[PDB]
Every structure is written in structure tokens, then in C-alpha cells.
Amino acid sequence: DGLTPLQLAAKMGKAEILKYILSREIKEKRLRSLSRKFTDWAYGPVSSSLYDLTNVDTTTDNSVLEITVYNTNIDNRHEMLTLEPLHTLLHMKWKKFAKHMFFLSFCFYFFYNITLTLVSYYRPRGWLQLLGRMFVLIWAMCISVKEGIAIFLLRPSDLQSILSDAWFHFVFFIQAVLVILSVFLYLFAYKEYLACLVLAMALGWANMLYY
Amino acid sequence: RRLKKRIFAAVSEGCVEELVELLVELQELCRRRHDEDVPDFLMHKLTASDTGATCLMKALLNINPNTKEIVRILLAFAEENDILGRFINAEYTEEAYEGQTALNIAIERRQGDIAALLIAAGADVNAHAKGAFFNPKYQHEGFYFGETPLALAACTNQPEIVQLLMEHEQTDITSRDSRGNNILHALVTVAEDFKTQNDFVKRMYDMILLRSGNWELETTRNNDGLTPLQLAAKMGKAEILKYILSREIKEKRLRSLSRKFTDWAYGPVSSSLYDLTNVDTTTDNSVLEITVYNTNIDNRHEMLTLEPLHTLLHMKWKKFAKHMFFLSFCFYFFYNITLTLVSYYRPRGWLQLLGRMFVLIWAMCISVKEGIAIFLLRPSDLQSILSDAWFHFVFFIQAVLVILSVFLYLFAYKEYLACLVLAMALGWANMLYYTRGFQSMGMYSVMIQKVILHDVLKFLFVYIVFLLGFGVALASLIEKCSSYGSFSDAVLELFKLTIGLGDLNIQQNSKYPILFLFLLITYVILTFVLLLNMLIALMGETVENVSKESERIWRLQRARTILEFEKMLPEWLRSRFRMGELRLCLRINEVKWTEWKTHVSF
Amino acid sequence: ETVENVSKESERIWRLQRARTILEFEKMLPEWLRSRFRMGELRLCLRINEVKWTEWKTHVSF
């Protein structure tokens, strides 16, 4: 299956073996390349070290951090993530860019829901609702194609039965296809568009709790 | 360029033949001189240029089990070139590790006999490792020990090296660092507030004070002006505070250092005299004031439950503070009663002025008192913690409300009734603060604060999203002419439906009544069954966490009331100190039955 | 009973949800402007530093 023993312990969830392998420190010479934790200096309680990242980073295709985060059939994932050099890697990758990207996506979804509510409320039962209706249309198209790719990538259909993050992709895709179907029914002659618009508007605020 | 790397690898390897052959090579290099200078060029070739580390320091960072001959012949090589006097006190030059000598690393690397050889060869003990690493901004950014070799040997649990240092003549014990802290402050900052199986720092502080045998170590204020007792009170160190506040030593010539003179004992009944040089509000800054107004600790009740703080708070309570608290409660009760009578029995005169003047003057007094108490609160960080930051705000808001309403009554505007009735509605919710006096009521008045700040605000921050979403989703599809008129009415109907009033009639003026009924049923299932009962379960968890514990917070609220009323008393008629001198020497007596039972039981 | 079983534990699940958010946004970043690797070679050799006060307390306490 193309797995390093480190990756196999990460797949099957073996905390003590992973702790030993991720911090392997041997002092005597001619056994130095086997070690992975070169300690630089120490002064009482403050110490500083160099860890190896041959597998424990997302630079490769399959990797230890990716396996131990996307793994679902174990129950000691926090006990495996709370140890170096996975924890500070997640922390540095958070405070480098991911906080800014999360806040950006949150502001875009907030503006999308605000314009959807204003369009679906201040309706004459034009000249300004197109300015904003195009934005709702293009961000609905973006969200549905993103959720469609993320669902079609979910091939084996077994990870849905576990709680972790299998629901919000479905609800985002359902809201996007609802607002797309409602603007199509508005462009056609049928006046049953109000139900499929108001269901999208009611779901668009229950989407926000994910943020 | 070649030799420096060779001997720096040789001192890390430990091969002594390489050491002596580069020794005689450098000796030939420094007997045939290029006529620049011998000693500083010897130091330049021996030491690194970027960091300042010596071969001695590089040997000491890389301690091998055969380093004794290495350091012996290295100091011998420094002796033959008579460079040892300005060599053994070498130090780093970078700004992070500035001034760190080889003696510090000899002490830190647990090498007692090597450190004894280092101090025997004439090292410097008055060093100050004043780098930015040694005193960082916070705790988890470095290692603080007082940048003194004696203090480092103290905090790193090396009592024989402490004994070797305090017997030496040049080691000035009370020398303060860049922070202004001596060895006792260093031990307090190192000390741990959890009673483990062993605490070396208390025995270290004990033996250091017993070896010094005089009061100048205890009395030296730091740069922030703190006794070590006050520093332990500031940082919250319970065992160190317990040892210092009851220090009892029996043998003579160590008697002035003690603070607990026991008078007599008879079985379990004992009687003692404690000292009150710092543990009283007579000074400006003080231990009791610090350990009560301290906010960033969580063992304040464990620090207050020990003598002579507890009986001092008890005596200061039952002397005057109960009477002053009851007096303030009666005045606030009369103020609220007259405010309610004035704001109720209104003709929409001849008697409401008699009482309206009293409301006006007590409103002025309360607002200027709360304004002084808020303007004294300068740094604006203590508000984020629960303790007593709210009631000053609510008292000031009620006072400015009743003042603004009587001003609007004296003017021509008739919008005064809202700003009067808000003051009247707030004046009774103010009264629950006066339920901190009893025991079975303060634990009911702090639970409102805990539940409001933890659960109800979070639940409303979630629930407002559902309310807005379903309010727009129901007010959108109502065909215009009914009941679900606009957004400012559908949310009223949904709040009535959430609290259990109103109606759920299907016959509405909509285009899709099945969809309208489905949205209403989804809202009732989402909030009436799921969310509100989940809030009830979380509030049950909060009440279970609080009611086992909050006697501590009631005692703390009462102690803050003690110190605030004592500050409110003036210096005139403060004839309520404790005891004449023997140093005020407060007298207590007590019963210790269980320790007496276990001691007589053997 | 369910809320009592969850609220003592679910900090783990919040940390796990945040870590899944990290890796999903890192997958959403393209290879272009992925100049955010860790450290030059010495094998990438990531450098950390830390404070271990309690094990230091128990070790210096003997």
C-alpha cells in the first residue's frame, strides 16, 4: 500500500510507537543519521531542538500529518496530534495564513447571505437587484462546483457514517443548488420560485454556525 | 582559521593528545611573536569572534565523562601564559546571553567539584547575566533565576555549592540584579504553589535566611518596591507565604528573625503573637491588600485561610464593618423606597420635594463615589475578570439615570418618564448586591453573574441567528393585504412562539401554506425542543460546577467589602490598631484539636 | 446525560475540527505562492524551542 512504518503507525493509530519514532534521539556516534531529534542546546527547563520532516509535512503526496488528521476509525487522534512536531506545525500553518483565509471566507459568506436576504426581502412582488443578483449567482456557482468536486472526490462512501465534517458539505451544496434553481425558476415563467428561494434563505443562516 | 576549528573539535571530542599537541603548537605560536601583543591576541585566537564563547565554555556545554584532565590542562595552559585572571571571567557578547560566564554553566551543568575548581582558580561571583533571554517579558520565553551564580545554585537545588559560595568572601549576598531582585525574590519567583512530594525551595529559603542571620535580606525592596513577603503575595505562593507568615525558631541569637512567638500551650489550646510589620493596612502597599485585590491567581482563599490574615479580617469585620454595611444597606433601601414612591404617586406638589431633595443629594453622592472609584480604575484590565467590576458600573448608571431624569423634569421636555422608570427598575436589581452579606445568599447572587456571563449570552448569540433567519424567511412570503406583517412583527410572533404564547394557526395569507407550516414546525422543533433544553443541560453543568465551590467566592466578596469599607474610613478615628509593641505583635489564641489528636495518639 | 458526556471532552473535537480546517485550506492553496516551507537542510530539519517546567522540576527536585 506504499506506507512507511511511520505512516502505518499513523494509519492504525499507535500513540507510543509514533511518539518514539517522531522523537528518536541517540547520542553515540555512527548511529547519528538514524536519529530524528537533534537537540541544539539546553539550559535548565528551556531547550531547543531540530526535528526531521521527511514525512511529517504536506510536501509529499501522502503524508503522516494528512493521514493522522483525515483518519476517522480511531479515537486517540488528539493524543496523536498533541505531540511534536505535528502540533507546532499545525500552529505555524494556522497563524501563517489560515486565520486570514478563514476570516476571508467568513466575510464572503456573510456578504453573500446579506445580499440574498436583501434581494429576497425587498422584492416588488428592478435597476438595483441585478447589481447583487449577479454576485449571488456567481458565488452560488462557485460554492456548488466546490462542493460538487469535494463530494465527487468522496468516493468510497463509508466516512459519512462518522460525525466528522460529512454534513456541512451536503448542506452547503443543497443551499447552492436551491438558490441556483430558484433564480432559474425566476428567469422562467413559473412563479413557484419563492419556495425554493426562501428555503435557500432559511438555510443560509443555519449554514453560518459552521463558522 | 585552521587551528581554531581544530581545538574546538578537540575540546568536544576529548582526545587529550590532540589537546596537548595543539597546546604546544599554540605555545610555539605565542612565543614567536609578531609584535602586535601577546594577551589579547591569545584571547582572539583562543575564543570565537561571533559569540564570545571560549574553549572552556565549549568543553562545559559538551561534558564528556573524562573532562577533568581537559579542564585541568586548559587552566594550566591559561596559567603558563598568565591569562587566567582575565580568562576565567570571560563571557558572551551577544545581547540575548550577555555576560554569562563559565561559572554559570559549571553550576547549571551539575558539576560540583568542577565548579569548586572554577571558584578555587579565582572566578568572578559578582556576575550579572543581564541578557534579554535571562529576563524575558513573560514566563514561557526564558529562564529567570536572578542572574547571580549564588541564586542559580539556590534555584537549581545544589546546596553544597550554595554552602561553598556563601562561605567565600567576595560573594555579596544582598546584591540586586537588573530587575532589582535578590536571592530571596529569586527563590519566590522560582517556587511552586503546588505541594508536591518535596519542595526544595522552602528548605533553601530557610537555610539561606538562617545562614544570613540578619534582617537586611528580608527588608530590601525591589525596583517595584516589594518585600519578598509581598512578592509571594503578589504572585500567589501559598507554601512560601505559610512558611514566612509563621516562622518560629527556638534557639537564641536567632530570635528577631522569627515572627510567631508562642506564648503558652496546654494540650490543644495554644496562644501566639504574630508580627504585623507588613500584614496590615497601616502601610501604603501591604500584604493583605495585595492578596485581596489580586485577580490573576486562583488560590486566594487558600492564601486567606491562614493566620494572621484570617483573624485580622474577622476582627476588622466584627469591629465596624458589619455596622457600616448595615448602615449603607438601610440608606440604599430608603433611597429606593422614596424613589419608588415619588415615581409612582405622581399627579401626571407640597410633599414630593420633601424626599426629592433626598433622592437628588444621595444620587449626587453615589455618582461622585462611583466616578472616583471608576477613575481610580486606570489600567482597564481587571474588568475582564468576574470580581466586582460590574456593580460599580450599574450603581453609576442608576445614579446618572436618576440625575438626568430630574434634570429633564426641571426642563420643559416630558421624555423624563423613561429615564426615571429605568432608574427605578434598576434600583431594585441593585439590591441583590446587598445579598453578599449573608452566607446562603451570596452563593445565589454570584450564580446569576456566572450563568449570564457563561451560558445565556452564548445561547443568545447562537439563537439570534435562527431568529433573524426564520424571521426574514417567514416575513418574505406573506402576500400583502395580516399577522406576519413585517420583520418587526414576525420576530415578535416567533419570540412569543418560543416562550410558549401566541398561536400556530395554519390559515395565513400566504401563497404556500404547507411551506409556511413546515417552516413554523421546523422553527419550533429547532428552538423549543432542541436548543432551549440544551441550554438547560449546560446551565445544570454550570450550577453543578459552581455550587460545590462558590463559598470561596462569597468569602472573597466579603473580604473585598472589608477592605473597601476600611479604605472608606478616614484616618481620623482610626483608633483600631491591634497591639502595643513587644513590631505590633498581634495576639491570637486557637484550638487545634485534630493535630493534637494525631500527636497525642502516638 | 449526553451534554454531561460531551462537555467534559469536546475540546478534543474542536481542536480536530480546526486541524481539518487547516489541512483543507492548505489543500485549497495552490502550488504557486507556496513559499511557506520550514527550514533549509542540515531533511528539512524544523527548529522548535519550548519550556518543559514540570519534568525539569521533578528532575532538579532529586
Side-chain angles (χ1 to χ4, degrees):
Chain A
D1 314 334
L3 306 186
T4 320
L6 172 68
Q7 295 161 335
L8 178 64
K11 168 73 72 66
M12 299 176 43
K14 308 273 182 189
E16 306 98 343
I17 296 302
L18 211 77
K19 184 184 287 184
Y20 167 69
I21 291 177
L22 271 177
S23 64
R24 198 170 49 220
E25 176 203 15
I26 42 181
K27 214 69 87 175
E28 55 265 18
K29 259 305 290 179
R30 205 189 57 87
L31 310 162
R32 185 250 194 196
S33 160
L34 298 188
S35 64
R36 296 176 66 100
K37 186 183 161 188
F38 320 113
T39 166
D40 214 9
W41 51 268
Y43 198 58
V46 163
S47 64
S48 179
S49 311
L50 295 170
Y51 292 87
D52 216 349
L53 304 187
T54 71
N55 310 136
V56 293
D57 205 302
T58 43
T59 60
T60 80
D61 314 311
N62 196 16
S63 159
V64 188
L65 172 79
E66 175 196 296
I67 276 171
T68 196
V69 163
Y70 283 132
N71 215 1
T72 71
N73 45 10
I74 47 183
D75 298 314
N76 43 5
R77 251 194 318 274
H78 167 78
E79 297 259 26
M80 290 171 69
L81 279 189
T82 179
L83 56 91
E84 296 290 329
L86 297 145
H87 174 76
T88 202
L89 187 49
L90 281 181
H91 195 79
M92 214 185 302
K93 218 178 297 192
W94 164 241
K95 78 168 49 188
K96 194 68 63 63
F97 58 92
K99 182 178 255 187
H100 300 136
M101 193 174 294
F102 187 68
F103 169 73
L104 193 139
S105 178
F106 164 64
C107 272
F108 277 177
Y109 206 78
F110 189 84
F111 274 6
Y112 160 61
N113 258 318
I114 282 299
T115 66
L116 184 53
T117 52
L118 281 188
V119 160
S120 161
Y121 190 38
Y122 285 138
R123 41 192 304 270
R125 318 284 171 187
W127 194 51
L128 199 38
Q129 81 181 1
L130 275 299
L131 181 46
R133 184 92 90 169
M134 272 73 92
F135 166 63
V136 165
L137 180 70
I138 61 181
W139 207 247
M141 214 90 66
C142 167
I143 281 177
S144 63
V145 303
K146 182 177 113 198
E147 295 321 289
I149 288 306
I151 285 170
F152 179 67
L153 199 164
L154 190 61
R155 185 79 260 180
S157 88
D158 61 328
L159 302 177
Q160 308 168 359
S161 65
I162 307 99
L163 183 66
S164 278
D165 214 1
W167 195 248
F168 292 120
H169 296 82
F170 277 161
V171 184
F172 278 147
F173 167 67
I174 278 177
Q175 190 262 359
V177 72
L178 265 180
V179 59
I180 285 298
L181 193 147
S182 54
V183 71
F184 267 18
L185 268 182
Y186 178 53
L187 262 188
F188 280 169
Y190 265 98
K191 291 272 186 175
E192 294 171 352
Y193 83 111
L194 195 44
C196 275
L197 165 65
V198 80
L199 285 181
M201 193 176 51
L203 208 44
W205 282 109
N207 272 340
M208 292 280 294
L209 260 64
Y210 153 71
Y211 281 137
Chain B
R1 49 180 190 276
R2 73 184 182 277
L3 192 46
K4 174 178 297 172
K5 304 174 59 173
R6 209 166 284 104
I7 185 167
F8 280 166
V11 291
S12 67
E13 188 164 31
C15 289
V16 197
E17 57 180 3
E18 304 176 356
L19 295 174
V20 293
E21 77 165 22
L22 311 172
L23 173 142
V24 298
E25 172 102 353
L26 191 53
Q27 180 69 218
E28 188 265 318
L29 201 57
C30 69
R31 64 169 65 152
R32 177 220 48 99
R33 290 314 290 162
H34 41 69
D35 304 71
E36 287 268 356
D37 70 296
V38 176
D40 295 331
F41 191 80
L42 262 173
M43 280 298 91
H44 165 262
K45 191 66 177 177
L46 192 57
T47 65
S49 79
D50 44 349
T51 81
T54 66
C55 50
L56 178 59
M57 296 167 167
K58 277 311 284 172
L60 285 163
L61 268 54
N62 285 358
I63 287 299
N64 43 356
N66 43 357
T67 182
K68 300 203 187 80
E69 295 302 320
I70 309 178
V71 65
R72 188 163 289 109
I73 71 182
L74 193 147
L75 271 192
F77 173 62
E79 184 259 6
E80 308 188 343
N81 299 329
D82 82 332
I83 209 54
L84 168 141
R86 68 141 287 165
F87 166 68
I88 205 148
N89 54 8
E91 81 293 328
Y92 275 32
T93 44
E94 42 184 338
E95 293 289 351
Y97 294 95
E98 168 163 7
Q100 172 170 8
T101 80
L103 179 51
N104 296 76
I105 317 170
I107 297 154
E108 199 267 346
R109 278 304 196 276
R110 283 273 201 177
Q111 290 312 121
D113 262 348
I114 310 184
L117 200 149
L118 263 288
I119 66 189
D124 194 13
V125 197
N126 300 150
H128 283 74
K130 43 195 299 309
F133 152 75
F134 284 83
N135 49 3
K137 181 207 305 175
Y138 267 90
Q139 178 256 316
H140 44 61
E141 323 180 318
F143 182 36
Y144 186 44
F145 54 90
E147 53 260 27
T148 285
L150 167 67
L152 179 66
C155 311
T156 51
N157 190 46
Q158 279 159 11
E160 45 189 0
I161 309 172
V162 180
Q163 284 155 349
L164 287 190
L165 281 172
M166 54 203 197
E167 192 176 1
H168 192 271
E169 56 268 3
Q170 303 305 104
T171 75
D172 178 79
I173 313 190
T174 189
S175 189
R176 306 191 286 118
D177 54 27
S178 73
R179 272 202 207 187
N181 275 329
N182 47 53
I183 175 169
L184 312 184
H185 301 82
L187 285 188
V188 168
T189 49
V190 155
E192 175 78 30
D193 46 352
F194 284 157
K195 179 64 191 62
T196 45
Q197 78 293 338
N198 195 357
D199 213 14
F200 63 97
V201 69
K202 187 207 303 177
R203 304 183 304 196
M204 200 79 50
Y205 178 82
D206 181 74
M207 67 162 270
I208 279 153
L209 192 47
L210 283 198
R211 170 71 157 84
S212 169
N214 205 344
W215 265 96
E216 86 270 13
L217 275 182
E218 200 84 19
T219 316
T220 39
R221 298 180 172 271
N222 73 320
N223 285 156
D224 314 334
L226 306 186
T227 320
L229 172 68
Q230 295 161 335
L231 178 64
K234 168 73 72 66
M235 299 176 43
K237 308 273 182 189
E239 306 98 343
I240 296 302
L241 211 77
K242 184 184 287 184
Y243 167 69
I244 291 177
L245 271 177
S246 64
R247 198 170 49 220
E248 176 203 15
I249 42 181
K250 214 69 87 175
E251 55 265 18
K252 259 305 290 179
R253 205 189 57 87
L254 310 162
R255 185 250 194 197
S256 160
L257 298 188
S258 64
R259 296 176 66 100
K260 186 183 161 188
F261 320 113
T262 166
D263 214 9
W264 51 268
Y266 198 58
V269 163
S270 178
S271 182
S272 311
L273 295 170
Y274 292 87
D275 216 349
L276 304 187
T277 71
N278 310 136
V279 293
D280 205 302
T281 43
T282 60
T283 80
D284 314 311
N285 196 16
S286 159
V287 188
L288 172 79
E289 175 196 296
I290 275 171
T291 196
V292 163
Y293 283 132
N294 215 1
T295 71
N296 45 10
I297 47 183
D298 298 314
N299 43 5
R300 251 194 318 274
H301 167 78
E302 297 259 26
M303 290 171 69
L304 279 189
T305 179
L306 56 91
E307 296 290 329
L309 297 145
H310 174 76
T311 202
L312 187 49
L313 281 181
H314 195 79
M315 214 185 302
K316 218 178 297 192
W317 164 241
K318 78 168 49 188
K319 194 68 63 63
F320 58 92
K322 182 178 255 187
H323 300 136
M324 193 174 294
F325 187 68
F326 169 73
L327 193 139
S328 178
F329 164 64
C330 272
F331 277 177
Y332 206 78
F333 189 84
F334 274 6
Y335 160 61
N336 258 318
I337 282 299
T338 67
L339 184 53
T340 52
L341 281 188
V342 160
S343 160
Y344 190 38
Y345 286 138
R346 41 192 304 270
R348 318 284 171 187
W350 194 51
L351 199 38
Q352 81 181 1
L353 275 299
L354 181 46
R356 184 92 90 169
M357 272 73 92
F358 166 63
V359 165
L360 180 70
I361 61 181
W362 207 247
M364 214 90 66
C365 167
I366 281 177
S367 63
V368 303
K369 182 177 113 198
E370 295 321 289
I372 288 306
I374 285 170
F375 179 67
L376 199 164
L377 190 60
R378 185 79 260 180
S380 88
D381 61 328
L382 302 177
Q383 308 168 359
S384 65
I385 307 99
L386 183 66
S387 278
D388 214 1
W390 195 248
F391 292 120
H392 296 82
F393 277 161
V394 184
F395 278 147
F396 167 67
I397 278 177
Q398 190 262 359
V400 72
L401 265 180
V402 59
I403 285 298
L404 193 147
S405 54
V406 71
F407 268 18
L408 268 182
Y409 178 53
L410 262 188
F411 280 169
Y413 265 98
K414 291 272 186 175
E415 293 171 352
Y416 83 111
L417 195 44
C419 275
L420 165 65
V421 80
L422 285 181
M424 193 176 51
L426 208 44
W428 282 109
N430 272 340
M431 292 280 294
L432 260 64
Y433 153 71
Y434 281 137
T435 77
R436 72 174 50 192
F438 304 96
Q439 179 180 334
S440 200
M441 290 293 308
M443 328 194 188
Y444 209 85
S445 161
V446 71
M447 279 187 202
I448 307 290
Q449 264 183 299
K450 288 292 293 184
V451 169
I452 279 294
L453 289 202
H454 278 194
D455 303 347
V456 172
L457 177 49
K458 190 183 307 193
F459 154 76
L460 288 176
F461 190 76
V462 161
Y463 171 83
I464 278 300
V465 163
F466 285 124
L467 196 63
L468 155 70
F470 280 85
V472 182
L474 290 180
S476 199
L477 56 96
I478 292 300
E479 302 294 324
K480 209 56 71 180
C481 81
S482 315
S483 57
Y484 292 84
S486 41
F487 182 68
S488 278
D489 184 1
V491 299
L492 167 68
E493 181 66 312
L494 286 185
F495 194 80
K496 294 209 304 189
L497 197 55
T498 297
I499 67 167
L501 290 180
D503 51 320
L504 199 144
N505 49 4
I506 186 169
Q507 294 297 110
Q508 295 289 149
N509 192 11
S510 89
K511 263 301 170 58
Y512 310 99
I514 283 174
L515 179 86
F516 193 86
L517 189 63
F518 164 69
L519 272 190
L520 213 54
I521 294 300
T522 319
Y523 173 69
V524 175
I525 287 177
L526 269 183
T527 74
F528 197 83
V529 172
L530 161 70
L531 193 42
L532 190 63
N533 294 338
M534 209 194 54
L535 169 68
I536 286 186
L538 198 50
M539 268 173 49
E541 284 319 292
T542 285
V543 165
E544 196 269 338
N545 283 324
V546 159
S547 159
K548 58 161 165 47
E549 179 263 354
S550 201
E551 192 259 8
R552 298 177 150 222
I553 321 174
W554 160 66
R555 291 273 178 83
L556 182 66
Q557 274 184 329
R558 185 188 281 230
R560 275 198 82 133
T561 301
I562 296 300
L563 293 202
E564 192 203 345
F565 280 156
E566 203 274 333
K567 268 167 178 38
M568 209 181 295
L569 265 186
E571 169 54 53
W572 172 56
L573 291 196
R574 199 97 57 87
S575 62
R576 296 168 200 82
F577 58 92
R578 305 295 106 189
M579 188 66 202
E581 281 82 10
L582 171 67
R583 328 285 292 275
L584 277 301
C585 276
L586 189 147
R587 164 179 292 274
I588 79 156
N589 50 3
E590 77 265 27
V591 176
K592 302 283 194 68
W593 207 279
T594 182
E595 163 261 348
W596 175 82
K597 193 83 176 194
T598 48
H599 177 264
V600 184
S601 198
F602 294 127
Chain C
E1 284 319 292
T2 285
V3 165
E4 196 269 338
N5 283 324
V6 159
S7 159
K8 58 161 165 47
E9 179 263 354
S10 201
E11 192 259 8
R12 298 177 150 223
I13 321 174
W14 160 65
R15 291 273 178 83
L16 182 66
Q17 274 184 329
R18 185 188 281 230
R20 275 198 82 133
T21 301
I22 296 300
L23 293 202
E24 192 203 345
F25 280 156
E26 203 274 333
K27 268 167 178 38
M28 209 181 295
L29 265 186
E31 169 54 53
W32 172 56
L33 291 196
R34 199 97 57 87
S35 62
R36 296 168 200 82
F37 58 92
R38 305 295 106 189
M39 188 66 202
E41 281 82 10
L42 171 67
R43 328 285 292 275
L44 277 301
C45 276
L46 189 147
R47 164 179 292 274
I48 79 156
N49 50 3
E50 77 265 27
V51 176
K52 302 283 194 68
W53 207 279
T54 182
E55 163 261 348
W56 175 82
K57 193 83 176 194
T58 48
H59 178 264
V60 184
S61 198
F62 294 127

